[PDB]
Design a protein around this nucleic acid. Structure first.
Length: 82
DNA sequence: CACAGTGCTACAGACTGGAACAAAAACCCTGCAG
């Protein structure tokens, strides 16, 4: 009664092409939007605490500081070999 | 005349060196004193 002439784009996509995708790639959730999307959170705390802050400069500094946050070289120091 | 900042800038402040001055510290000394 609810699916006669209408289906959500996703119920279709997830009931149809997934086997083909994971045959093609072998992974989906690894390619998920999360890495981008989640990241937005950081952007917000970078537009507040580490911003310049005036319209001209601040994008530069959010960007720079973001790049530093996400570098490996820094993160290696976290465990500090345990 | 809200206030803790907001990073990167600005160049203010922190440094040497010999050449020599001066003052002061705390000894030794000699001076003039009972």
């Amino acid at each position: 009664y609810r699916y006669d002439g209408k289906i959500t784009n996703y119920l279709h996509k997830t009931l149809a092409h997934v086997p083909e995708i994971v045959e093609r790639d072998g992974s989906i959730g690894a390619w998920a939007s999360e890495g981008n999307e989640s990241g937005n959170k950081l952007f917000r705390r970078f537009r507040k605490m580490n911003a310049r802050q005036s319209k001209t400069f601040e994008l530069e500094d959010i960007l720079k500081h973001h790049w530093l946050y996400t570098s490996k070289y820094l993160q290696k120091f976290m465990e500090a070999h345990k």
